[PDB]
PDB file of C-alpha atoms and ligand atoms in Angstrom:
ATOM      1  CA  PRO A  17      -9.126  18.599 -22.782  1.00 20.06           C
ATOM      2  CA  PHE A  18      -8.749  20.969 -19.901  1.00 17.77           C
ATOM      3  CA  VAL A  19     -10.428  21.760 -16.521  1.00 19.15           C
ATOM      4  CA  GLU A  20     -10.810  25.412 -15.348  1.00 21.37           C
ATOM      5  CA  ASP A  21      -6.915  26.544 -15.432  1.00 23.31           C
ATOM      6  CA  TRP A  22      -5.516  23.116 -15.900  1.00 20.73           C
ATOM      7  CA  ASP A  23      -4.873  21.171 -19.157  1.00 23.16           C
ATOM      8  CA  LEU A  24      -5.107  17.455 -19.087  1.00 23.67           C
ATOM      9  CA  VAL A  25      -1.907  16.528 -20.919  1.00 24.99           C
ATOM     10  CA  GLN A  26      -1.763  12.747 -20.617  1.00 22.02           C
ATOM     11  CA  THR A  27      -2.710   9.406 -18.925  1.00 20.40           C
ATOM     12  CA  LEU A  28      -0.588   8.412 -16.030  1.00 21.98           C
ATOM     13  CA  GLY A  29      -2.652   5.390 -15.471  1.00 24.07           C
ATOM     14  CA  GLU A  30      -5.726   3.703 -13.829  1.00 24.80           C
ATOM     15  CA  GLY A  31      -6.386   3.684 -10.137  1.00 23.86           C
ATOM     16  CA  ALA A  32      -8.772   1.207  -8.576  1.00 21.57           C
ATOM     17  CA  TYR A  33     -11.521   3.353 -10.105  1.00 20.89           C
ATOM     18  CA  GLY A  34     -11.229   5.674 -13.121  1.00 21.38           C
ATOM     19  CA  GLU A  35      -8.585   7.452 -15.035  1.00 21.62           C
ATOM     20  CA  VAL A  36      -5.439   9.400 -13.570  1.00 24.03           C
ATOM     21  CA  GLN A  37      -4.177  12.196 -15.927  1.00 26.16           C
ATOM     22  CA  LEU A  38      -1.380  14.483 -15.450  1.00 23.99           C
ATOM     23  CA  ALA A  39      -2.619  18.087 -15.282  1.00 22.63           C
ATOM     24  CA  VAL A  40      -0.431  21.051 -16.006  1.00 23.97           C
ATOM     25  CA  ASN A  41      -1.559  24.581 -15.164  1.00 25.25           C
ATOM     26  CA  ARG A  42      -1.187  26.704 -18.375  1.00 25.32           C
ATOM     27  CA  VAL A  43      -0.208  29.879 -16.226  1.00 24.46           C
ATOM     28  CA  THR A  44       1.984  28.494 -13.632  1.00 22.28           C
ATOM     29  CA  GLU A  45       3.332  25.401 -15.301  1.00 20.14           C
ATOM     30  CA  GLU A  46       2.561  23.343 -11.777  1.00 18.81           C
ATOM     31  CA  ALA A  47       2.014  19.609 -12.611  1.00 21.78           C
ATOM     32  CA  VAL A  48      -0.378  17.559 -10.430  1.00 20.81           C
ATOM     33  CA  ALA A  49      -2.428  14.455 -10.803  1.00 21.63           C
ATOM     34  CA  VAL A  50      -6.199  14.304 -11.331  1.00 19.76           C
ATOM     35  CA  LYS A  51      -8.332  11.333 -11.050  1.00 19.07           C
ATOM     36  CA  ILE A  52     -11.378  11.425 -13.224  1.00 21.60           C
ATOM     37  CA  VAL A  53     -14.491   9.735 -12.067  1.00 20.34           C
ATOM     38  CA  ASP A  54     -17.703   9.360 -14.185  1.00 21.34           C
ATOM     39  CA  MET A  55     -20.971  10.133 -12.196  1.00 21.17           C
ATOM     40  CA  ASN A  56     -19.083   6.250  -2.708  1.00 21.37           C
ATOM     41  CA  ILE A  57     -16.821   9.228  -3.587  1.00 21.47           C
ATOM     42  CA  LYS A  58     -18.213  11.435  -0.977  1.00 19.84           C
ATOM     43  CA  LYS A  59     -16.418   9.025   1.559  1.00 20.96           C
ATOM     44  CA  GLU A  60     -13.507   9.031  -0.498  1.00 20.15           C
ATOM     45  CA  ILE A  61     -12.889  12.908  -0.577  1.00 18.35           C
ATOM     46  CA  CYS A  62     -13.839  12.871   3.024  1.00 15.81           C
ATOM     47  CA  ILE A  63     -10.726  10.440   3.710  1.00 15.11           C
ATOM     48  CA  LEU A  64      -8.536  12.219   1.227  1.00 13.08           C
ATOM     49  CA  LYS A  65      -9.034  15.559   3.181  1.00 15.10           C
ATOM     50  CA  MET A  66      -7.721  13.855   6.270  1.00 11.69           C
ATOM     51  CA  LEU A  67      -4.375  13.143   4.568  1.00 12.90           C
ATOM     52  CA  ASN A  68      -1.326  15.006   5.576  1.00 17.46           C
ATOM     53  CA  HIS A  69       2.091  13.194   5.568  1.00 18.92           C
ATOM     54  CA  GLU A  70       5.000  13.067   3.528  1.00 15.18           C
ATOM     55  CA  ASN A  71       4.529   9.303   2.791  1.00 15.75           C
ATOM     56  CA  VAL A  72       0.967   9.780   1.695  1.00 14.40           C
ATOM     57  CA  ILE A  73      -0.204  11.268  -1.684  1.00 14.60           C
ATOM     58  CA  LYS A  74      -1.635  14.771  -0.771  1.00 17.30           C
ATOM     59  CA  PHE A  75      -5.209  15.735  -1.757  1.00 15.80           C
ATOM     60  CA  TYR A  76      -5.289  19.299  -3.259  1.00 14.69           C
ATOM     61  CA  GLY A  77      -9.114  19.313  -3.922  1.00 14.37           C
ATOM     62  CA  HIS A  78     -12.055  18.478  -6.167  1.00 12.23           C
ATOM     63  CA  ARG A  79     -14.387  19.994  -8.769  1.00 11.56           C
ATOM     64  CA  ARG A  80     -17.800  18.331  -9.941  1.00  7.99           C
ATOM     65  CA  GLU A  81     -18.149  19.350 -13.767  1.00  8.96           C
ATOM     66  CA  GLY A  82     -21.563  17.858 -14.657  1.00  9.00           C
ATOM     67  CA  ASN A  83     -20.983  14.134 -15.037  1.00  8.35           C
ATOM     68  CA  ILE A  84     -17.322  14.097 -14.179  1.00  6.72           C
ATOM     69  CA  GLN A  85     -15.652  14.691 -10.663  1.00  6.48           C
ATOM     70  CA  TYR A  86     -11.943  15.851 -10.764  1.00  7.60           C
ATOM     71  CA  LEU A  87      -9.961  14.892  -7.842  1.00  8.90           C
ATOM     72  CA  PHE A  88      -6.726  16.682  -7.648  1.00 11.20           C
ATOM     73  CA  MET A  89      -3.668  15.024  -6.035  1.00 13.14           C
ATOM     74  CA  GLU A  90       0.163  15.154  -5.617  1.00 13.36           C
ATOM     75  CA  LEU A  91       2.058  14.006  -8.631  1.00 12.93           C
ATOM     76  CA  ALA A  92       4.828  11.635  -8.032  1.00 16.30           C
ATOM     77  CA  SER A  93       7.275  11.852 -10.995  1.00 14.89           C
ATOM     78  CA  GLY A  94       9.161   8.650 -10.106  1.00 15.02           C
ATOM     79  CA  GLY A  95       6.447   6.310 -10.967  1.00 17.62           C
ATOM     80  CA  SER A  96       5.726   3.250  -8.838  1.00 19.38           C
ATOM     81  CA  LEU A  97       7.552   0.720  -6.864  1.00 21.43           C
ATOM     82  CA  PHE A  98       6.219  -1.802  -9.015  1.00 23.13           C
ATOM     83  CA  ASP A  99       8.661  -0.553 -11.781  1.00 22.40           C
ATOM     84  CA  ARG A 100      11.684  -0.899  -9.531  1.00 20.87           C
ATOM     85  CA  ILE A 101      11.214  -4.467  -8.841  1.00 19.39           C
ATOM     86  CA  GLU A 102      13.015  -6.703 -11.255  1.00 21.67           C
ATOM     87  CA  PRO A 103      11.288 -10.004 -11.739  1.00 22.00           C
ATOM     88  CA  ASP A 104      12.919 -12.806 -10.103  1.00 21.76           C
ATOM     89  CA  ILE A 105      15.419 -10.522  -8.535  1.00 22.03           C
ATOM     90  CA  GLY A 106      13.798  -7.805  -6.540  1.00 22.42           C
ATOM     91  CA  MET A 107      15.963  -4.824  -5.809  1.00 23.84           C
ATOM     92  CA  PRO A 108      19.155  -4.049  -3.616  1.00 26.52           C
ATOM     93  CA  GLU A 109      18.488  -4.796  -0.094  1.00 27.69           C
ATOM     94  CA  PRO A 110      19.236  -1.422   1.160  1.00 26.45           C
ATOM     95  CA  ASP A 111      16.884   0.206  -1.375  1.00 26.76           C
ATOM     96  CA  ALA A 112      14.272  -2.332  -0.002  1.00 24.87           C
ATOM     97  CA  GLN A 113      14.918  -1.350   3.586  1.00 27.55           C
ATOM     98  CA  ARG A 114      14.437   2.365   2.845  1.00 30.20           C
ATOM     99  CA  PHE A 115      11.305   1.931   1.011  1.00 32.56           C
ATOM    100  CA  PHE A 116      10.098  -0.295   3.755  1.00 32.22           C
ATOM    101  CA  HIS A 117      10.841   2.409   6.199  1.00 32.68           C
ATOM    102  CA  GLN A 118       8.835   4.804   4.373  1.00 31.78           C
ATOM    103  CA  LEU A 119       6.117   2.491   3.789  1.00 29.59           C
ATOM    104  CA  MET A 120       5.844   1.863   7.512  1.00 28.70           C
ATOM    105  CA  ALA A 121       6.086   5.553   8.332  1.00 24.15           C
ATOM    106  CA  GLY A 122       2.925   6.095   5.896  1.00 24.66           C
ATOM    107  CA  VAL A 123       1.066   2.999   7.456  1.00 24.00           C
ATOM    108  CA  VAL A 124       1.645   4.331  11.086  1.00 20.94           C
ATOM    109  CA  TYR A 125       0.284   7.663   9.969  1.00 21.04           C
ATOM    110  CA  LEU A 126      -2.919   6.247   8.409  1.00 20.45           C
ATOM    111  CA  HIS A 127      -3.669   3.928  11.464  1.00 22.42           C
ATOM    112  CA  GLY A 128      -2.745   6.789  13.636  1.00 21.76           C
ATOM    113  CA  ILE A 129      -5.874   8.594  12.085  1.00 21.16           C
ATOM    114  CA  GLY A 130      -8.075   5.689  12.225  1.00 24.97           C
ATOM    115  CA  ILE A 131      -7.656   4.846   8.475  1.00 26.41           C
ATOM    116  CA  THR A 132      -7.012   1.556   6.777  1.00 26.12           C
ATOM    117  CA  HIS A 133      -5.794   1.503   3.210  1.00 25.14           C
ATOM    118  CA  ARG A 134      -6.829  -2.089   2.619  1.00 26.00           C
ATOM    119  CA  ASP A 135      -5.040  -2.432  -0.695  1.00 24.38           C
ATOM    120  CA  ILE A 136      -1.267  -1.903  -0.149  1.00 22.40           C
ATOM    121  CA  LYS A 137       0.776  -3.340  -3.043  1.00 23.74           C
ATOM    122  CA  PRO A 138       3.463  -1.981  -5.444  1.00 23.95           C
ATOM    123  CA  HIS A 139       1.164  -0.226  -7.850  1.00 23.14           C
ATOM    124  CA  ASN A 140      -0.111   1.910  -5.168  1.00 19.59           C
ATOM    125  CA  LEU A 141       3.165   2.736  -3.658  1.00 22.21           C
ATOM    126  CA  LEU A 142       4.364   5.680  -5.677  1.00 22.05           C
ATOM    127  CA  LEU A 143       7.795   7.362  -5.970  1.00 24.76           C
ATOM    128  CA  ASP A 144       8.456  11.302  -5.959  1.00 22.66           C
ATOM    129  CA  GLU A 145      11.655  12.772  -7.769  1.00 27.13           C
ATOM    130  CA  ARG A 146      13.822  11.882  -4.824  1.00 25.90           C
ATOM    131  CA  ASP A 147      12.382   8.263  -4.647  1.00 25.89           C
ATOM    132  CA  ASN A 148      10.397   9.089  -1.601  1.00 26.83           C
ATOM    133  CA  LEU A 149       7.595   6.500  -1.433  1.00 32.48           C
ATOM    134  CA  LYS A 150       3.956   7.924  -1.143  1.00 29.92           C
ATOM    135  CA  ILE A 151       0.800   5.672  -0.583  1.00 25.07           C
ATOM    136  CA  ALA A 152      -1.771   6.270  -3.152  1.00 22.56           C
ATOM    137  CA  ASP A 153      -5.429   5.405  -3.675  1.00 24.94           C
ATOM    138  CA  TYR A 154      -8.114   5.809  -0.961  1.00 24.29           C
ATOM    139  CA  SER A 155     -10.918   4.316  -2.931  1.00 26.41           C
ATOM    140  CA  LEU A 156     -10.913   1.321  -0.556  1.00 25.38           C
ATOM    141  CA  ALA A 157      -9.934   2.988   2.588  1.00 24.09           C
ATOM    142  CA  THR A 158     -12.165   3.132   5.376  1.00 25.71           C
ATOM    143  CA  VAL A 159     -12.303   4.440   9.037  1.00 28.08           C
ATOM    144  CA  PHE A 160     -11.654   1.634  11.611  1.00 25.48           C
ATOM    145  CA  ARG A 161     -11.360   3.886  14.499  1.00 25.81           C
ATOM    146  CA  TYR A 162     -13.513   6.737  15.642  1.00 25.38           C
ATOM    147  CA  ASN A 163     -13.867   8.545  18.897  1.00 28.91           C
ATOM    148  CA  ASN A 164     -11.256   6.021  20.161  1.00 27.67           C
ATOM    149  CA  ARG A 165     -13.399   3.102  19.518  1.00 26.69           C
ATOM    150  CA  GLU A 166     -12.116   0.535  17.040  1.00 27.05           C
ATOM    151  CA  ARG A 167     -14.536  -1.141  14.624  1.00 26.63           C
ATOM    152  CA  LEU A 168     -13.808  -4.638  13.286  1.00 28.50           C
ATOM    153  CA  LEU A 169     -14.171  -4.863   9.483  1.00 28.20           C
ATOM    154  CA  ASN A 170     -16.075  -7.384   7.421  1.00 26.28           C
ATOM    155  CA  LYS A 171     -15.913  -6.390   3.788  1.00 24.12           C
ATOM    156  CA  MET A 172     -13.559  -8.572   1.560  1.00 26.49           C
ATOM    157  CA  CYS A 173     -11.511  -6.327  -0.640  1.00 26.41           C
ATOM    158  CA  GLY A 174      -7.873  -5.963  -1.642  1.00 25.58           C
ATOM    159  CA  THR A 175      -5.844  -8.046  -4.091  1.00 23.92           C
ATOM    160  CA  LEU A 176      -5.523 -11.854  -3.411  1.00 25.08           C
ATOM    161  CA  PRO A 177      -1.838 -12.213  -3.307  1.00 28.81           C
ATOM    162  CA  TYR A 178      -1.579  -9.535  -0.865  1.00 34.28           C
ATOM    163  CA  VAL A 179      -4.535 -10.096   1.458  1.00 33.12           C
ATOM    164  CA  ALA A 180      -4.194 -11.561   4.953  1.00 31.30           C
ATOM    165  CA  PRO A 181      -5.616 -15.013   5.550  1.00 31.39           C
ATOM    166  CA  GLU A 182      -8.228 -14.062   8.115  1.00 27.66           C
ATOM    167  CA  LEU A 183      -9.920 -11.966   5.531  1.00 22.90           C
ATOM    168  CA  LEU A 184     -10.772 -15.122   3.492  1.00 23.25           C
ATOM    169  CA  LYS A 185     -11.449 -17.079   6.855  1.00 24.20           C
ATOM    170  CA  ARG A 186     -13.320 -14.708   9.370  1.00 21.15           C
ATOM    171  CA  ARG A 187     -16.515 -13.023   9.352  1.00 19.40           C
ATOM    172  CA  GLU A 188     -14.842 -10.123  11.271  1.00 16.63           C
ATOM    173  CA  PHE A 189     -11.420  -8.950  11.677  1.00 16.04           C
ATOM    174  CA  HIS A 190      -9.088  -6.234  12.756  1.00 21.31           C
ATOM    175  CA  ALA A 191      -7.861  -3.667  10.172  1.00 20.99           C
ATOM    176  CA  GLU A 192      -4.310  -3.099  11.212  1.00 22.05           C
ATOM    177  CA  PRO A 193      -2.931  -6.600  11.060  1.00 20.29           C
ATOM    178  CA  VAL A 194      -4.524  -6.910   7.318  1.00 20.98           C
ATOM    179  CA  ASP A 195      -2.543  -3.756   6.273  1.00 20.50           C
ATOM    180  CA  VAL A 196       0.544  -5.144   8.126  1.00 22.67           C
ATOM    181  CA  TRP A 197       0.446  -8.479   6.213  1.00 22.97           C
ATOM    182  CA  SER A 198       0.345  -6.795   2.898  1.00 22.40           C
ATOM    183  CA  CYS A 199       3.384  -4.714   3.792  1.00 22.73           C
ATOM    184  CA  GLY A 200       5.066  -8.205   4.335  1.00 23.21           C
ATOM    185  CA  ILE A 201       4.075  -9.199   0.764  1.00 23.35           C
ATOM    186  CA  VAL A 202       5.305  -6.024  -0.463  1.00 25.79           C
ATOM    187  CA  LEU A 203       8.746  -6.526   1.219  1.00 28.77           C
ATOM    188  CA  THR A 204       8.806 -10.057  -0.206  1.00 33.04           C
ATOM    189  CA  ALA A 205       8.325  -8.778  -3.758  1.00 32.25           C
ATOM    190  CA  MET A 206      10.964  -6.268  -3.110  1.00 33.15           C
ATOM    191  CA  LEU A 207      13.546  -8.753  -1.910  1.00 32.11           C
ATOM    192  CA  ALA A 208      12.838 -11.773  -4.285  1.00 31.71           C
ATOM    193  CA  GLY A 209      10.956 -10.100  -7.318  1.00 33.14           C
ATOM    194  CA  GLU A 210       8.234 -12.674  -7.052  1.00 35.25           C
ATOM    195  CA  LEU A 211       5.065 -13.059  -4.988  1.00 38.81           C
ATOM    196  CA  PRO A 212       4.929 -16.082  -2.650  1.00 37.83           C
ATOM    197  CA  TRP A 213       1.519 -17.383  -3.356  1.00 41.48           C
ATOM    198  CA  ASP A 214      -1.514 -16.872  -5.330  1.00 42.36           C
ATOM    199  CA  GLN A 215      -3.410 -16.404  -1.922  1.00 41.69           C
ATOM    200  CA  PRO A 216      -2.994 -17.303   1.694  1.00 40.42           C
ATOM    201  CA  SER A 217      -5.590 -20.233   1.741  1.00 41.51           C
ATOM    202  CA  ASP A 218      -5.242 -23.903   3.126  1.00 39.27           C
ATOM    203  CA  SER A 219      -5.667 -25.027  -0.579  1.00 42.43           C
ATOM    204  CA  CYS A 220      -2.617 -23.094  -1.926  1.00 38.38           C
ATOM    205  CA  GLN A 221       0.319 -25.225  -1.964  1.00 38.21           C
ATOM    206  CA  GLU A 222       2.953 -22.348  -1.654  1.00 39.38           C
ATOM    207  CA  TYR A 223       1.114 -21.094   1.382  1.00 38.03           C
ATOM    208  CA  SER A 224       1.094 -24.640   2.964  1.00 41.94           C
ATOM    209  CA  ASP A 225       4.790 -24.700   2.307  1.00 42.39           C
ATOM    210  CA  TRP A 226       5.408 -21.506   4.213  1.00 42.26           C
ATOM    211  CA  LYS A 227       3.307 -22.631   7.035  1.00 39.65           C
ATOM    212  CA  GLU A 228       5.617 -25.749   7.190  1.00 41.53           C
ATOM    213  CA  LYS A 229       8.557 -23.476   7.080  1.00 38.56           C
ATOM    214  CA  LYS A 230       9.982 -24.823   3.753  1.00 39.28           C
ATOM    215  CA  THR A 231      12.271 -21.729   3.277  1.00 41.83           C
ATOM    216  CA  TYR A 232      14.578 -23.566   0.996  1.00 40.28           C
ATOM    217  CA  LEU A 233      12.189 -22.910  -1.570  1.00 39.23           C
ATOM    218  CA  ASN A 234      11.625 -19.771  -3.523  1.00 39.56           C
ATOM    219  CA  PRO A 235      10.985 -17.015  -2.854  1.00 41.51           C
ATOM    220  CA  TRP A 236      12.365 -17.442   0.505  1.00 41.18           C
ATOM    221  CA  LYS A 237      15.582 -18.858  -0.480  1.00 46.19           C
ATOM    222  CA  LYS A 238      16.671 -15.679  -2.352  1.00 46.62           C
ATOM    223  CA  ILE A 239      16.132 -13.552   0.904  1.00 47.60           C
ATOM    224  CA  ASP A 240      18.894 -13.073   3.516  1.00 49.22           C
ATOM    225  CA  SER A 241      18.318 -14.436   6.934  1.00 48.28           C
ATOM    226  CA  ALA A 242      17.861 -11.240   8.563  1.00 43.54           C
ATOM    227  CA  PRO A 243      14.875  -9.763   6.544  1.00 43.59           C
ATOM    228  CA  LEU A 244      13.625 -13.272   6.380  1.00 44.29           C
ATOM    229  CA  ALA A 245      13.276 -13.627   9.986  1.00 46.34           C
ATOM    230  CA  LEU A 246      11.122 -10.129   9.837  1.00 47.66           C
ATOM    231  CA  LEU A 247       8.990 -11.986   7.217  1.00 42.97           C
ATOM    232  CA  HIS A 248       8.413 -14.927   9.473  1.00 39.33           C
ATOM    233  CA  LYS A 249       7.027 -12.357  12.203  1.00 39.50           C
ATOM    234  CA  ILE A 250       4.872 -10.642   9.857  1.00 42.25           C
ATOM    235  CA  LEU A 251       3.445 -13.342   7.632  1.00 43.30           C
ATOM    236  CA  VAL A 252       2.019 -15.251  10.645  1.00 43.72           C
ATOM    237  CA  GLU A 253      -1.388 -16.690  10.067  1.00 42.38           C
ATOM    238  CA  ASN A 254      -3.072 -15.703  13.308  1.00 41.62           C
ATOM    239  CA  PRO A 255      -3.398 -11.922  13.436  1.00 39.50           C
ATOM    240  CA  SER A 256      -3.435 -11.641  17.154  1.00 37.30           C
ATOM    241  CA  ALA A 257       0.125 -13.505  17.057  1.00 37.07           C
ATOM    242  CA  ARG A 258       1.309 -11.173  14.012  1.00 37.82           C
ATOM    243  CA  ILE A 259       3.799  -8.689  14.630  1.00 43.18           C
ATOM    244  CA  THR A 260       2.642  -5.062  15.167  1.00 40.53           C
ATOM    245  CA  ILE A 261       4.204  -2.021  13.800  1.00 43.35           C
ATOM    246  CA  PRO A 262       5.708  -0.948  17.119  1.00 42.86           C
ATOM    247  CA  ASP A 263       7.593  -4.394  17.160  1.00 40.55           C
ATOM    248  CA  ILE A 264       8.508  -4.169  13.617  1.00 41.78           C
ATOM    249  CA  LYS A 265      10.313  -1.091  14.566  1.00 39.86           C
ATOM    250  CA  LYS A 266      12.504  -3.144  17.141  1.00 41.19           C
ATOM    251  CA  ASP A 267      13.307  -5.837  14.530  1.00 42.31           C
ATOM    252  CA  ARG A 268      16.860  -6.598  13.656  1.00 42.49           C
ATOM    253  CA  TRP A 269      16.862  -6.159  10.146  1.00 44.05           C
ATOM    254  CA  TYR A 270      14.570  -3.116  10.521  1.00 43.57           C
ATOM    255  CA  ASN A 271      17.222  -1.326  12.232  1.00 43.19           C
ATOM    256  CA  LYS A 272      20.534  -2.871  10.483  1.00 41.61           C
ATOM    257  CA  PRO A 273      22.585  -0.280   8.713  1.00 42.16           C
ATOM    258  CA  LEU A 274      22.743  -0.880   5.074  1.00 37.94           C
ATOM    259  CA  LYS A 275      24.396   0.745   1.849  1.00 42.13           C
TER     260      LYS A 275
HETATM  261  N1  LIG B 308      -6.916   7.786  -6.518  1.00 37.74           N
HETATM  262  C1  LIG B 308      -5.837   7.522  -6.890  1.00 37.74           C
HETATM  263  C2  LIG B 308      -4.707   7.009  -7.446  1.00 37.74           C
HETATM  264  C3  LIG B 308      -4.164   5.623  -7.706  1.00 37.74           C
HETATM  265  C4  LIG B 308      -2.839   5.436  -8.041  1.00 37.74           C
HETATM  266  C5  LIG B 308      -1.977   6.523  -8.437  1.00 37.74           C
HETATM  267  C6  LIG B 308      -2.481   7.882  -8.339  1.00 37.74           C
HETATM  268  C7  LIG B 308      -1.332   8.901  -8.514  1.00 37.74           C
HETATM  269  C8  LIG B 308      -1.488   9.945  -7.961  1.00 37.74           C
HETATM  270  N2  LIG B 308      -0.303  10.709  -8.199  1.00 37.74           N
HETATM  271  C9  LIG B 308       0.108  10.073  -8.977  1.00 37.74           C
HETATM  272  N3  LIG B 308       1.471  10.408  -9.790  1.00 37.74           N
HETATM  273  C10 LIG B 308       1.827   9.909 -10.769  1.00 37.74           C
HETATM  274  N4  LIG B 308       1.274   8.560 -11.089  1.00 37.74           N
HETATM  275  C11 LIG B 308       0.274   8.060 -10.306  1.00 37.74           C
HETATM  276  N5  LIG B 308      -0.183   6.991 -11.015  1.00 37.74           N
HETATM  277  C12 LIG B 308      -1.753   6.900 -11.087  1.00 37.74           C
HETATM  278  C13 LIG B 308      -2.156   5.526 -11.476  1.00 37.74           C
HETATM  279  O1  LIG B 308      -1.261   4.802 -12.362  1.00 37.74           O
HETATM  280  C14 LIG B 308       0.083   4.636 -11.790  1.00 37.74           C
HETATM  281  C15 LIG B 308       0.758   6.091 -11.692  1.00 37.74           C
HETATM  282  C16 LIG B 308      -0.415   9.212  -9.395  1.00 37.74           C
HETATM  283  C17 LIG B 308      -3.814   8.143  -7.812  1.00 37.74           C
HETATM  284 CL1  LIG B 309       6.361  -8.641  -8.237  1.00 35.22          CL
END
């Protein structure tokens, strides 16, 4: 199959909705990614056209072709961060730190334009040929700030092991601390190659253990004291006591020179 000048050469994977194909232009040989959706997406395109940052997947544009919408996007030839995390091990701390810096640069950018991603996790964090991180998939994204006025969110969405506890507990909540939380679970996954809990609920034993500071258990025992002190500031149950991005950027481990 093919779309105007582009051939659909192969399946890269599935986003939150629909299929993503590698599109190669037959003329120019340029390779991009195309998300193919059958038959909400006005909002998504609208958010996609806002995006201009080196740690965010770039939107090239779209074509309706009968039933099928085709959303053209930057290709990331390095695959996902998911594939760089070795189970039970993680990755080298300097690599983790570098990816964390890039993730924060992307999140700050989004938040600065009033967008929350709402599903940060390693599958949505892609790597270009130089291992630069790009935040992908704006199908759950939404505006939380417009004309300088913040709106609280109420929709439950995301992925349970990554989702902040207020989203399970509060009728309405601030957007930014939710995305911060999920960045903390990504950090843990990078440093330990395991997720700390199935969900951050009072009924989840591993979540209770963390609240009781049992860091002699896994995954925490695999993580050095400096990044762990950051994770103690991020994975804070009360979102108004949770560290903000400005303060993450002052954290000791964040600023530690590494290999
Ligand atoms: N909407 C959206 C969305 C969600 C997730 C990823 C992509 C995606 C954009 N550029 C890519 N480059 C290389 N692989 C990619 N993926 C696609 C999905 O499977 C993983 C590998 C992408 C887009
Ligand atoms: Cl993992």
